[model samples]
Target: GPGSMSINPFDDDNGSFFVLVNDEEQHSLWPAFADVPAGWRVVHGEADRAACLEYIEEHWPDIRPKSLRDKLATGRGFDQ
Candidate 1:
């Protein structure tokens, strides 16, 4: 490997990031210039470090297990 170094990634936020709030509320932070990983979508940010964290904290609350988190927001539909 070469030039492969990084902070805590999901923890280190020295730069701007996009917050991925998935179906199960699986919160994740991605670099501002990177594409979000599969099975997830950006619900907030591409803004400053604090803004993304603020968004996750403000909305990605609860931190509950998937089983407990189900049936709540499952009321929505996705299609064309």
Candidate 2:
């Protein structure tokens, strides 16, 4: 499908959600029903949406990846 559809987290459906982490350490809330993208891997799997969200909240205190943090620390600024 070319278009997108919105999903409701509060509805309490049977679907599962996962917390994904990329190489840069960025986290994303992903639906378990869909195939995870190539650059992303599941850190936590097959949980309710709230639990996934909670895990992200507890773990990802800073959204910036380690590479970015190191770059900023050097004051070189982002190359891109």
Candidate 3:
């Protein structure tokens, strides 16, 4: 009835969020109230918008996936 920090995807102002990264190493904001999906995993736990953004800024650099990094490091399209 009153104020609640529940899982509301429409609630943009809600300070609860999760930093999710997929197999490709791409990161994005996710609602903390929701369960971590099948493919993606949580790099950062429930936090405010600013904190989540800061975590993303600090962790995700170059925006390149791990697969790409492996390829470049191996001098060919590598898979591991």
Ranking by TM-score: 3, 2, 1
Instruction: List the global CA lDDT of all models.
Output: 0.42, 0.43, 0.43
Q: Kindly report which residue stretches of model 2 are placed more than 4 angstroms away from their true locations once superposed.
A: 1-17, 48-80
lDDT of 1 at 59: 59
What lDDT tens digits, residue by residue, belong to model 3 across residues 10-37? 4334323345666665567667555656
lDDT of candidate 1 over 52-74, digit per residue (tens): 56655665443323332222222
Q: Give the lowest summed-lDDT range of ten residues in model 2.
A: 68-77
| Candidate 1 TM-score versus the reference | 0.36
Residue 22 error, candidate 1, Å? 2.0
Clashing pairs in 3: none
